[PDB]
Design a protein around this nucleic acid. Structure first.
Ligand SMILES: [Mg+2]
Length: 245
RNA sequence: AGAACUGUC
RNA sequence: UCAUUCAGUUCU
């Protein structure tokens, strides 16, 4: 047995921080790590070459446009921003209608997934996971978004639909590939899992966390909703004026 | 009031 | 650039 690294999906929830311009954090490797299951020292350099290849294309990604295209602020946002710019010893009902408009602005699972897929396809090279495996990875992203609170994914359900032979940059020490490949699959699946974790944990999740406030409603059960960071800043700021209530 | 830059869960 | 909270600086 091999226990794959955990996908941390609890990170996407309840992030209040707005960072001005989009494109994740300053703490992320994207702005200014772990090698284990790799064979020899050569694979580690090949992985490091993809990572620096990855961060460069990331800066070429325009998050302002990709958001606009996919996950879009409401057309009344300016009016919503204006109405919260008011109220700051009255305001009782009108705020209730103002909260109903802000929470109305949730972003659909398909929207979020199309956004994520667009980020990954631009950010992550197709040669990293291999052509067919990269396609399997992108398809599985909708389930990741759609899934409720406390619902998670396992790397086990990723790799099992993939092929380790689709990865061309994996290296073969002293040729075990065609001799015993039950072993080769066993060793390389450990690396492929680390790559899947890498994309999801260090890219997909921090993108979602940073740009969106993800939570669940009391009335909606464990089902989760994606709110735009600016929208939630309005909500958060409209809750603060309720300090009196 | 318009505009520009920078740090950042 | 649909947006740009918080903090800090600057040009009319
Ligand atoms: Mg200021």
């Amino acid at each position: 047995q091999y226990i794959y690294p955990e996908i941390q999906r609890s990170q996407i929830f309840y992030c209040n921080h707005m960072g001005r311009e989009p494109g994740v954090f300053k703490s992320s490797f994207f702005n200014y790590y772990q090698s284990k299951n790799f064979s020899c020292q050569e694979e580690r350099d090949l992985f490091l070459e993809f990572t620096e290849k990855i961060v460069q294309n990331f800066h070429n990604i325009n998050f302002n446009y990709l958001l606009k295209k996919f996950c879009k602020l409401p057309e009344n946002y300016q009016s919503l921003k204006s109405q919260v710019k008011q109220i700051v010893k009255a305001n009782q009902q009108s705020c209730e209608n103002l909260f109903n408009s802000l929470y109305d602005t949730e972003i659909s699972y398909k929207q979020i997934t199309n956004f994520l897929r667009q980020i990954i396809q631009n950010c992550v090279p197709n040669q990293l996971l291999g052509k067919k495996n990269f396609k399997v990875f992108l398809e599985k992203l909708y389930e990741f978004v759609q899934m409720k609170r406390f619902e998670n994914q396992k790397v086990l359900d990723y790799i099992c639909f993939m092929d380790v032979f689709d990865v061309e940059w994996f290296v073969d020490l002293k040729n075990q590939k065609f001799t015993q490949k039950r072993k080769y699959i066993s060793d390389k699946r450990k690396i492929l899992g680390d790559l899947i974790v890498f994309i999801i944990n260090k890219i997909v999740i921090p993108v979602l966390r940073y740009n969106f406030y993800i939570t669940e409603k009391h009335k909606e059960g464990s089902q989760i909703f994606y709110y735009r960071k600016p929208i939630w800043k309005l909500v958060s700021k409209l809750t603060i004026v309720k300090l009196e209530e």
